[model samples]
Target: MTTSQKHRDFVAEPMGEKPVGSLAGIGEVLGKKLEERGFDKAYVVLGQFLVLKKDEDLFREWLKDTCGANAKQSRDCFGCLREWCDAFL
Candidate 1:
């Protein structure tokens, strides 16, 4: 699959207090869900990602359960985050 601009933008920079919606998988509704659950920041979500040891299946499962993410969203989000960690972590 092709990389998204959002994914590129995210991975290209240092982590900051970016919104959860800034993650590739998160959209308006999903982000709202995440925000309400105290995961409003991208770094918070990244913390969760790191806690899961960067396991693709675990991260995607968390997205599916917590954010109601679909398959595409899960894949793309994980792609960007995993790559971001590769570059920066």
Candidate 2:
């Protein structure tokens, strides 16, 4: 999937009640892991991001460590959350 579409779409709204799977680079495996870790919802993860004060490097590292995301995956996921925050919070 192109980052343009996912990026634009995800960043376009508040993402209330959306699933963790809605995040970029978080496919079924990562989504399931996040759910198991109590981030079943996208907003919950967004909460974590906010709690971290939108720290991109920290968030990306945490995401990578949690789900073994590669550089690209981590970047995509972080960017998605960042954009969401910019639009919503």
Candidate 3:
């Protein structure tokens, strides 16, 4: 699916057991990096997001440092998780 579609689908639900790669901005490269860093599951990353209290800058920097995510990538990813939390958590 296209990135936009992935983003839309991802935020549309609870994300239960989805893989880390399912996140909007996470391509295979970043996904693998996240997995290596103990975020193989989408919920694991979400747990970290929540652990950080959903702080935008902290999450963005973590994303960048973890996967070399660009600004836009991290922003989109953060927005996706934040909105998901608003809807479900």
Candidate 4:
């Protein structure tokens, strides 16, 4: 799966207080859904990442179920979060 430049950019940074929309797959609509579900920030979603034990499939499914993310979106966000964890956590 090809990753977006947004994904690369996000993974390269500290993710300090970045909004949920800062994530690669989370656009305005999805970001709002995630925020409504308490994932207001990138770090909050990172907590779910760690909670899922960094499992890509699990994260993807959770993203879909929680915020209606499609396959590409789920994968993109999963990749971004996974890369962020690899670099920072």
Q: Which candidate has the highest TM-score of all?
A: 1
Off by over 4 Å in 2: none
Write one digit per residue (lDDT tens) for candidate 2, span 27-78. 8998998898898998888888888888988998888878778898788888
TM-score of each: 0.94, 0.89, 0.92, 0.93
Candidate 4: tens digits of C-alpha lDDT, residues 1-89: 36788898899889999999999989999999999999999999999999989998889999999999999899889889888888987
Q: Between which residue pairs do clashes occur in model 2? A: none
**Cα RMSD to native, each candidate?**
1.2, 1.9, 2.4, 1.4
lDDT of 3 by residue, 8-78 (tens): 89989889899988898889989998998888999998988999999999999999998899998898889
Query: What TM-score number comes out for model 1?
Result: 0.94
lDDT of 1 by residue, 1-89 (tens): 37888899899988788888888878899999888889988999899999999999999999899878999989988998998999999
Model 2: weakest 10-residue lDDT segment is 1-10
Candidate 1 error regions (>4 Å): none
Say which prediction, candidate 1 or candidate 2, comes out ahead on lDDT.
Answer: 1
CA-lDDT, candidates in order = 0.89, 0.84, 0.89, 0.92
lDDT score at residue 42, model 4, on the 0-100 scale: 93
RMSD of 3: 2.4
